[PDB]
Amino acid sequence: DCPPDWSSYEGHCYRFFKEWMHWDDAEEFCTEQQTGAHLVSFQSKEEADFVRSLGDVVWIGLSDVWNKCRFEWTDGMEFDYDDYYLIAEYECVASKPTNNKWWIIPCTRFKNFVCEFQA
Amino acid sequence: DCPSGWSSYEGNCYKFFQQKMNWADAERFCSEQAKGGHLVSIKIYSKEKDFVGDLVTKNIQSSDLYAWIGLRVENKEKQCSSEWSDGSSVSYENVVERTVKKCFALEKDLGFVLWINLYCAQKNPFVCKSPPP
Amino acid sequence: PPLHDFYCSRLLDLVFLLDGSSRLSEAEFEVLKAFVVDMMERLRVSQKWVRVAVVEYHDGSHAYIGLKDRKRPSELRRIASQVKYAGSQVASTSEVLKYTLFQIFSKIDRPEASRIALLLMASQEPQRMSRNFVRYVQGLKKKKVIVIPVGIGPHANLKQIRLIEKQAPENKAFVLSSVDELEQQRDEIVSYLCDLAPE
Q: What CATH number does residue C61 fall under?
């Protein structure tokens, strides 16, 4: 149901890429493949298994996981989020097809990844 | 006006402790040092920044690289990304705990003035802050 | 001989930092270069009074003029007016601040003069290149280098412009709609940063 070299699963197209890029490039690269393609995203374990079926960690669709957080001081100090710019490490999520455990690591890291989309 | 070993600034008392503890034990420890005591809170764009900065530099009687402060990620989740890069909301998660960095600390370089989020279970020295008794 | 009624005759090290991203077209990058040539026209250029440096930054940086270059103010103005249009996809403010910090001001051999970095921003660098942004802005502040963010257009990194104006009291921001305001605001900017340098 999908293009050449890609793989199909539940109306969705996947494809591992043995190319070393940082999260943002991996993500962008995916989007430049097909209209509607992103870094793989797991909405259930099953979906993960199929991706495993396709170093040690691959980029998945989770970006800037810390700066998208809410912050609070232990003494309830009041602050203006506008002042908290890039305050936390810029980190992204990489998967380990083996144990299937996700690692939150620096987005600048170079990891192989998997793209995904729907026809 | 502040107690023994504590420094004072804009109305409060500050103290650097070398004892290395995880973020949560450091927070509890500071609350027992005084009524209204907590891991130091810092107004990002202020002079309290350099005060606390100097306090830790000329006291960090160790080569430690971090000093816990009272700021912490507030979300209960292990990572605060609501949706994936596609758009799908996040619900199924499988994040490795030892990888979550929700507790903040002062960084050594530039003199403990820059913040950095770390893995809370980590043990670091800290700065306490309580209002004058 | 001073070309205009304004001739900042103070002790100053002024560093012009120009966005080299495609966010500015080739024609727009021209107005900006013209803006730079003007400031230089309203400064007293020479190793004694005002010293200038001109940098075009992209993912990396290209320095056309350094503070120690010994050249007539006319030559330097010619050089700046000949700065090649980069048009790169990225203009890293972080990296050009790092360059300003660790190279342009590697050593501070002119303590008697004010050190200013005029950051002419027209874009937003990828978040992954900003880890050390604050670190560099802070490093700059310790060496008494004033950073004056000049936002140009709807793509300038407002968040960074804002943060910078904060980090240090002297750091003041100038936000503009386009490069058409550079001259509409040239005199205020020159006057402002000239009153930050010693007599």
A: 3.40.50.410
